[PDB]
Amino acid sequence: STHLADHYNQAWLFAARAHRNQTLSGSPLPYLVHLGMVANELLAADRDGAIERLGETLQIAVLHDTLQDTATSPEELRQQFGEFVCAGVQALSKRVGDGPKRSLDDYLQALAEGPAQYALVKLCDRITNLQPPPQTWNQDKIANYHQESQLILARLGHAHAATARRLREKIEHYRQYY
Amino acid sequence: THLADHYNQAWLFAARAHRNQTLSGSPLPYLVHLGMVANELLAADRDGAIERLGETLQIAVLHDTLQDTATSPEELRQQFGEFVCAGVQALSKRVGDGPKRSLDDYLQALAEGPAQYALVKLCDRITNLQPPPQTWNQDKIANYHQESQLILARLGHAHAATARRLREKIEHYRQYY
Ligand SMILES: [Mn+2]
Ligand SMILES: [Mn+2]
Secondary structure, X not given: OOOHHHHHHHHHHHHHHHOOOOEOOOOOOEXXXXXXXXXXXXXXXXXXXXXXXXXXXXXXXXXXXXXXXXXXXXXXXXHHHOHHHHHHHHHHOOOOOOOOOOOHHHHHHHHHHOOXXXXXXXXXXXXXXXXXXXXXXXXXXXXXXXXXXXXXXXHHHHHOHHHHHXXXXXXXXXXXXX | OOHHHHHHHXXXXXXXXXXXXXXXXXXXXXXXXXXXXXXXXXXXXXXXXXXXXXXXXXXXXXXXXXXXXXXXXXXHHHHHOHHHHHHXXXXXXXXXXXXXXXXXXXHHHHHHOOHHHHHHHHHHHHHHOOOOOOOOOHHHHHHHHHHHHHHHHHHHHHOHHHHHHHHHHHHHHHHHO
């Protein structure tokens, strides 16, 4: 049916519109910079362990922030991308629009017990977020982000062996910033 | 070095280089195009393994830096290596407000050079055969369709699966005129 690049493009154009008013933290660069790196991580992960429903899981990597940070409705995602993608973005949303924000334990438990592909997108998200910390973070903020990353590894590393290995290496590398 | 670490180095370099640039006539950042080209390139590897995949993915990210940005060949050579620099050069039909190379010259040099650079151009044209912007007249759509046929003929040797994909995109694009 649908080429992997056509799945990407549909999600990518959607996300570029949805996130058009959003930048990276402390940087004037488009938020799209983050989503590019998450999606690339996910497609690279397939090379080191094939992913069931790779097209839709790539789309979930592109769209994973739409319900939290944009004017995007769950109904829009379900109509345009299907249930599995909608439920992927919901699983990855700590908070949907101005609804209640879920605790990390609740968030990680639901991802651990749910479809492994959703958990795998979270590993790709944290790997992306273990680039060098923003220049305005103190030693304490860095240290806390490092410890939170270790919980994400412990709770979700089951999802994909190679990507868990890569997240551990990023966690070990990030130790140098504090 | 991990394929995604190669992507990130080139991606962050490109986001900075292209920071004031939109898609022509859109508020959307130029980065939108680069994401689709790099994704087409990494997808292509699944259907026929590419030699020097990491550097080829960086070439797909960086392919417009010498045309459109303050980027120098020296910077590309120093940060990404001679293979990436030479790839970006092969794909630059012009450098800034300089004279364009003729299509014949451009495609000939891509056909006779490393097959990876030709493969990135097929991924570039695949990306540019999405529905044409509202502002393109019938003539402009028609001519872009026929230029696409020349790219497939001259460069389709580079990667069989990607050539089959460009052919399908060309046959789909015919509906717009
Ligand atoms: Mn994210
Ligand atoms: Mn291009």
